[PDB]
Ligand binder design. Structure first.
Ligand SMILES: NC(=O)c1ccc[n+]([C@@H]2O[C@H](COP(=O)([O-])OP(=O)(O)OC[C@H]3O[C@@H](n4cnc5c(N)ncnc54)[C@H](OP(=O)(O)O)[C@@H]3O)[C@@H](O)[C@H]2O)c1
Length: 357
């Protein structure tokens, strides 16, 4: 009845020589009183995994954000979950004070309340594809100053004059979850991405979608939005996406939010960027002197977000990004990361269903 974690496990990490490495003698985490122990069944690959390298990498700390798995033990201070339940959530990868916690392990623990039970109708693979998307979508809306959806409302809030939100990179894993959430809160997303993903973008909430390569496209968008676009969410964050977003924003100003720190005007634009670890209310060691401290308000926001998003996912109002599923082990995760780093996925999320053993 007391739970004793296995003596060692396989986990994906980074070397002393900055190489991604399968480690077959990695530690297993201890079980917090307020968390559950998870045998990991599926994981999703995120670009942020592939950037944990150089001095962003903590050698021997576990990689990986998105996991879904089977509860094999339950903390003493936890009710409503039992052994055998299925959960999905986010880990805080490569955190130096919790090196034995990451999605890319055979055994992990839930973190904070940034997790939920998998609805009866979803697979481990569908559920694993969700966590970073949900967490980022909520953090982006928070930064933009937009209320999260009500899980109990019968329709989105009404706006006789549309409130537009530009989503640059409409086929990104983050944008497809975010656009559904924006629609639920009564906003009208307009998206830019490649033509082969137009159907995908519209299916996920874009009123209209445009090829970002199209000449003078920001004039088109300005006109579409009656020269009063006040919100832009940049899911790409490079020199070109930033220029484009600034150009599309209306003459009276607006708010630009990016998913990464943005590259090296007088235009009346407020700016923010999503810091992923803040979903846990934990803080970080960048950027870049002092990092950011943790905070109970950030902690409570992530818990509120996950309670809301967990229900939306439960009732079919929030759907996962299209999947590319690989059956395999930790080498398949490492191969997965290379595919993602090389920019080789479009309109799909790479999910590894773990063959145990
Ligand atoms: N700070 C955080 O915690 C956090 C969280 C989530 C994401 N992010 C960052 O956000 C970015 C997106 O990640 P994600 O997982 O949401 O997306 P993703 O699924 O990896 O996005 C891939 C898509 O980006 C588009 N694309 C790639 N390069 C582009 C370019 N130069 N210009 C226009 N479109 C481009 C392609 O779309 P088309 O083929 O349709 O053109 C491709 O389908 C990554 O940089 C990631 O590191 C950060």
């Amino acid at each position: 009845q007391p739970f004793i974690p296995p003596p060692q496990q396989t986990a994906l990490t980074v070397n002393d020589h900055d190489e991604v490495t399968v480690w077959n003698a990695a530690p297993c985490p201890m079980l917090p009183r307020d968390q559950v122990y998870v045998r990991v069944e599926a994981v999703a690959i995120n670009p942020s995994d592939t950037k944990m390298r150089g001095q962003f990498a903590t050698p021997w700390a576990f990689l990986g954000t998105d996991y879904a798995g089977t509860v094999v033990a339950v903390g003493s201070d936890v009710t409503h979950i039992q052994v055998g339940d299925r959960v999905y959530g986010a880990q805080n990868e490569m955190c130096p004070r919790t090196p034995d916690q990451g999605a890319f392990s055979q055994y992990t623990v839930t973190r904070g309340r940034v997790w939920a039970k998998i609805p009866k109708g979803l697979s481990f693979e569908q559920a694993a594809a969700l966590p970073a998307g949900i967490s980022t979508a909520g953090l982006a809306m928070k930064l933009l100053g937009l209320p999260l959806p009500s899980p109990s409302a019968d329709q989105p809030p009404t706006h006789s004059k549309p409130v537009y939100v530009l989503v640059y990179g409409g086929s990104t894993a983050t944008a497809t979850v975010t656009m559904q959430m924006l629609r639920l809160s009564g906003y009208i997303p307009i998206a830019t991405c490649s033509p082969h993903n137009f159907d995908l973008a519209k299916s996920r909430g874009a009123e209209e979608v445009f090829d970002y390569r199209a000449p003078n496209l920001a004039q088109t968008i300005r006109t579409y939005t009656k020269n009063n676009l006040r919100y832009a969410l940049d899911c790409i964050t490079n020199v070109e996406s930033t220029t484009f977003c600034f150009a599309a924003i209306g003459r009276a100003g607006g708010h630009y939010v990016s998913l990464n720190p943005f590259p090296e005007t007088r235009k009346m634009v407020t700016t923010d960027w999503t810091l992923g670890p803040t979903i846990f209310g934990e803080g970080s060691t960048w950027p870049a002197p002092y990092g950011r401290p943790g905070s109970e308000e950030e902690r409570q926001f992530g818990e509120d977000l996950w309670r809301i998003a967990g229900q939306l996912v439960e009732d079919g109002r929030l759907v996962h990004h299209p999947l590319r599923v690989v059956q395999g082990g930790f080498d398949h995760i490492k191969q997965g990361m290379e595919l993602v780093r090389k920019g080789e996925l479009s309109g799909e999320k790479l999910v590894v269903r773990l063959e145990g053993p």
